[PDB]
Structures are given as C-alpha cells and as structure tokens.
C-alpha cells in the first residue's frame, strides 16, 4: 500500500488568462484505482473570473485511472514522491494555453502546483465570451517514443447554439524517478462540471478516466 483506496486532493493554481491573474484552490478526493474523483474549487483571487471555466479543468492527475493488469501505471509507481507534467492546448482559433503541474504526495493526500498561462484569446470568441458548456469525452493516445511519457488528445468544447470549438492537447510527463514504462495504450475520461455559482467562484468537477489497450 501507498496509493490508497481513497486519496485526497489538496491544490493551487496560479496563472493568467488574456492578462487576468487569478488563483484557484481545491480540495477533493477520489478513487485512485476506479478512476473516479471529485474536486470543490474556489475562485481566490481574480473573481469574477471573465473567461470559460472550461478551459481550466483539464489541468485540475493521471493517477485517477483504472488501469488494467498488465498495462504499467506509470502515475501510480511514481509515488511517494510523484511526478510532473507540461502541456500546451493549442485552440482553432488561435488561443494558446500552456500549463504546468507539479504532484506530490503526502499521507494520504496528492498535492498540486499548477501554473496556467492563456494568450490570444479573441475577446469576442466563445472563451472570452464564456458560450461553452463541456468537453467532448474523447480516447487520447499515451506513448513514450522518447523525453519519456507523453499524451496527446484532440479536444473540443461543446458551444451554445450547437457547434464545436477544438483544442489540440499535448502532454509529456516526467516522473521523479524511474519507473516501469508501458507501451502505447489509450485513456478514455470524461470531465464534467456537477456544479457551480453564478460566476463560477464555487466549481464542483468530476473525471471518470480508464486506461484501453
């Protein structure tokens, strides 16, 4: 035993959105093993948040997935002490996000460092004027090739009105020590936001993520 049944989640993130700081604190906990978890966010800083919230979930931890008996977890081997990753989401319209986290374990808790930087959002696109509603539930592709573990994943936010808005997101993952790497596989999951407030100062979020040969 040291990823348990039930693991808490403790994290921060700091960062900027067309210019606008904000900070956002969470507590959670989750089913590392069924690849369930749920996460109570708070708007700390920078209320009211003029942007999507949609575009932050994603970066509020792979170790939330069930994996199967003979795909190495890399995420689960890499505690106690855990590991990083850093991912860009490239938007069709010419957004950028990059993002960064920082796991660490502690009991019987993870902890997150989390900097996100957005950039070139339109101040009239479907961002900047909060007309998204949710993520597709897309598979993503997990390989190694080289730097070491990386993830890709074609994303897009559903739009009020019916249409779609895509994301290209790219992951590369670095555990803090050496772990048993595993072969290209896929991750299925679907985020949702269960609940929240008016501007979204109280966010309620849930993945459920499985790892598919």
Known sequence: SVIKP??????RMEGAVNGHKFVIEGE???????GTQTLD??????????????????????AFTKYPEDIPDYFKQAFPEGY???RSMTYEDQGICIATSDITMEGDCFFYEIRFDGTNFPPNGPVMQKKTLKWKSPTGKMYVEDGVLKGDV????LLEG????????????????DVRLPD?????????????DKDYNKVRLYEHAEARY
């Open 41 to 62: 966010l708070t708007v700390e800083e920078g209320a009211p948040l003029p942007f999507s919230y949609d575009i932050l979930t994603p970066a509020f931890n792979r």
């Open 28 to 34: 959670g906990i989750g089913k590392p093993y069924e």
């Open 6 to 11: 039930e693991m808490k989640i403790k994290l």
């Open 162 to 177: 019916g249409g779609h808005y895509r994301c290209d997101f790219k992951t590369t993952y670095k555990a803090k020590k």
């Open 154 to 157: 074609e994303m897009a936010l």
């Open 84 to 86: 990083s990753w850093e």
């Open 184 to 196: 290209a596989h896929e991750v299925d999951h679907r985020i949702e936001i269960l609940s929240h």
